[PDB]
Design an enzyme around this catalytic site. Structure first.
Site, short mmCIF file in Angstrom:
data_model
loop_
_atom_site.label_atom_id
_atom_site.label_comp_id
_atom_site.label_asym_id
_atom_site.label_seq_id
_atom_site.Cartn_x
_atom_site.Cartn_y
_atom_site.Cartn_z
N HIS B 134 19.65 69.29 91.76
CA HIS B 134 20.04 68.23 92.74
C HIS B 134 18.91 67.29 93.04
O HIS B 134 17.71 67.99 93.18
CB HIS B 134 20.53 68.41 94.27
CG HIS B 134 21.21 67.71 95.17
ND1 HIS B 134 20.60 66.75 95.89
CD2 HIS B 134 22.63 67.51 95.39
CE1 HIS B 134 21.44 65.88 96.43
NE2 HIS B 134 22.62 66.25 96.10
N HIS B 135 19.03 65.96 92.83
CA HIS B 135 17.95 64.97 92.95
C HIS B 135 16.94 65.05 93.99
O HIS B 135 15.76 65.11 94.07
CB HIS B 135 18.57 63.70 92.80
CG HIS B 135 17.49 62.71 91.99
ND1 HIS B 135 16.26 62.13 92.99
CD2 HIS B 135 17.43 62.09 90.95
CE1 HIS B 135 15.72 61.28 92.22
NE2 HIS B 135 16.40 61.25 90.99
N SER B 136 17.69 65.35 95.19
CA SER B 136 16.81 65.37 96.38
C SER B 136 15.70 66.80 96.41
O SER B 136 14.87 66.64 97.04
CB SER B 136 17.80 65.51 97.76
OG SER B 136 18.40 66.61 97.52
N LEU B 137 16.22 67.55 95.62
CA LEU B 137 15.22 68.81 95.53
C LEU B 137 14.35 68.61 94.42
O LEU B 137 12.95 68.92 94.39
CB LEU B 137 16.11 70.03 95.00
CG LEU B 137 15.25 71.26 94.97
CD1 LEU B 137 14.88 71.86 96.48
CD2 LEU B 137 16.05 72.55 94.49
#
Ligand code: CL
Ligand code: CL
Ligand code: CL
Ligand code: CL
Ligand code: CL
Ligand code: CL
Lengths: 411, 396
Positions: B134-137
């Site tokens: 996931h991009h936020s990670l």
């Protein structure tokens, strides 16, 4: 076009990432006699061809200003809905169930008709599988698993049979926010004048563990005669035993017995997971359900529907909100929807076993669903992978529950 | 750890229609003289590397209201690491369909939002690694960097670990408008790419040799990035024309460098004309070159977010070009044959073209909404055809 009756709207509404609201079914077949080594790849090729799709599989969700309606899908992409997949080595039952657990976790796309058929190859000894996924807003659970049977025929000599996509809440109302409809539940509950805490009954993730297995019917009937009980009693006892073993093994068995939500009408049947001997537990289950059904003898459909709706309103408030643990009312659903009495074939491929795949929810981590097919009774256990570690072991716990009854009576 | 604010955005942008996870398709060859059960053997050994280093052991939580990472105590490596197989005949086409399906599925926020899918059943002694994070990670450039940093140039290096184990809308949209009105004081056509999308995906990937592209460079006096762009321009032009949906005005590509909006000259008819106007366009465009850029894009953010501003679309497609390793790479003796990024689609950005390079080749990763872009895989042909037209016209 065709509007969305209020129960269909409900399954759309309480759907979230951790509780997809689709049902599924897992059909296992054998290669038809005299099939080439590569029979499944051949099969996938001609299913891709079959492009005609009839209701309800060509319906798709659309809104008319504010209200949800079905509409005839002009441009359906069959290779979105039909999929050819393969099991990883070594292609045996443990792998088939992992495949269904992964695939059943995934939310369906609301912008297309909400069904998938998954043809699985790579099974060991000349078998293949169909995993079918349909949203409950589009097809409920039993007619789904009736379509999957109606899709078959009794004659193994017959060929050229179609695929499934081409075949011949009382006082609720509206969309709302959760506090709004939860408050309408308090009002309903309070002007109606006014189950233990368990590891099964907590908030869940969206990852699934699926466990299915077959048990021979006459093996179970033998236990019926010995104890003078019904088939439904023994299979419920198998669930009670399995649940008991599983929660002890987790050191999480409650002191009060577990309670099960059981369609028959709706029974809130004690599973008596506080009882140790198997024969004792079966019979307390038997009389407990016998007596709970008799509370329905002198009741009309209008009565049952209203008694059912009023009894469960506190449980609905707790499921939706998690703010009323004392109202949990049942720890698990155990559904039993009988099936076809004789062997079946898809274009000469014998159906060897059909297993429903049901819906978990926040505070219902485990859903036990049962059906019968000819010789056997079919167990489908679907659960949240995080809150129910090692859920496949419940297959051995069910089997041990039946063998304990068998030993106790010497069959 | 609290999420930095750009990590918060990718959770907030996410919906069923636009998951905000990135992915990588790594293609490997069997190590020399490895058995036929190599991947099953490899699968069973990766189930054992059970210790997980950050960020792969972080998981999303909230302190009262604001989102924070916490170390995940009870990591279930059977959930995050999967072992899966291609159906018959095990071609790259099956491999691209597998990625297309996996890439459509939202990730579970209750667990570290990463996944590695080891894929067996490839035709000729190869396996594949489809990683999804996931991009936020982990953003896209870190994912790809991490994915190559996991490898080594030494084909004899072994005991190399896997990637997970190594050292409201009205309110926001109205604030966008206010930022635009206090910035507009400053002294892209309608297109089928730019509608609302579904969450179902189609992924198409392919490699091209850099020697083939360099020959075309010298013939026309353009750079590698120009010709790679001209392939994209040529590919999009053919695709839209076959769909009877090529607009009058030329497509504009969002292209990170800073950020330049480059005309793709999709109205131009000839390959060399299109190549050269693209080259001069991007020249001029960067010859003009975090405040001009992040203010000239607020109108585009407004339309993307709300659909209420179609003349603000500003660009029809993203074409990102991250460079990658120069020399052949290896994983416990398995030669990396190819590494393809899988990027993010959005409402009114139905197509995303992400490019990288590995060793002798440039890698094209096309990720698109399956309903908006019927037959997305034809683009790989139209990409190749764009390069052939240039070769054919220069007599190579
Ligand atoms: Cl999912
Ligand atoms: Cl769903
Ligand atoms: Cl779907
Ligand atoms: Cl899972
Ligand atoms: Cl996940
Ligand atoms: Cl898809």
């Amino acid at each position: 076009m065709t509007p969305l009756n209020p129960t269909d709207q409900l399954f759309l509404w309480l759907e979230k990432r951790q509780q997809p609201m689709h049902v599924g079914g897992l059909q296992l077949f054998s290669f038809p006699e005299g099939a080439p080594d590569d029979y499944v790849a051949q099969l996938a090729d001609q299913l891709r061809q079959k492009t005609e799709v009839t209701a309800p599989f060509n319906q798709r969700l659309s809104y008319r200003l504010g209200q949800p309606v079905w509409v005839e899908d002009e441009h359906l992409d069959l290779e979105h809905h039909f999929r050819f997949e393969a099991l990883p080595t070594p292609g045996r039952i443990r792998e088939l169930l992992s495949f269904v657990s992964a695939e059943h976790s995934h939310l369906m796309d609301r912008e297309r008709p909400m069904w998938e058929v998954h043809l699985i190859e790579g099974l060991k000894d000349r078998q293949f599988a169909l995993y079918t996924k349909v949203h409950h807003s589009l097809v409920d659970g039993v007619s789904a698993m009736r379509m999957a049977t109606r899709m078959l025929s009794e004659n193994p000599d017959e060929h050229g049979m179609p695929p499934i996509w081409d075949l011949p809440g009382l006082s609720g109302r509206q969309l709302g926010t959760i506090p709004t409809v939860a408050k309408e539940l308090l009002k309903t509950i309070n002007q109606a004048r006014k189950a233990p805490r368990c590891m099964l009954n907590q908030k869940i993730t969206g990852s699934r563990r699926f466990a299915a297995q077959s048990w021979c019917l006459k093996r179970i009937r033998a236990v019926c005669e010995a104890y003078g009980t019904t088939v439904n009693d023994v299979v419920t006892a198998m669930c009670a035993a399995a649940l008991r073993t599983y929660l002890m093994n987790q050191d999480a068995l409650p002191e009060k017995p577990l309670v099960a939500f059981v369609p028959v009408g709706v029974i809130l049947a004690s599973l008596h997971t506080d009882v140790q001997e198997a024969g004792e537990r079966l019979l307390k289950i038997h009389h407990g359900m016998e007596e709970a059904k008799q509370r329905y003898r002198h009741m009309s459909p209008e009565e049952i529907v209203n008694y059912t709706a009023l009894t469960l309103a506190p449980a609905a408030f707790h499921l939706l909100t998690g703010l009323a643990p004392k109202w949990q009312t049942f720890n698990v659903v155990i559904s039993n929807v009988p099936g076809p009495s004789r062997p079946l074939y898809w274009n000469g491929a014998k159906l060897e076993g059909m297993y429903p795949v049901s819906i978990d929810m926040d505070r219902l981590a485990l859903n036990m669903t049962l059906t019968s097919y000819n010789d056997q009774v079919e167990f489908g256990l679907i659960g949240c992978r995080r809150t129910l570690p090692s859920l496949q072991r419940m297959l051995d716990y069910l089997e041990q529950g039946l063998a304990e009854l068998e030993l106790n009576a010497g069959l």
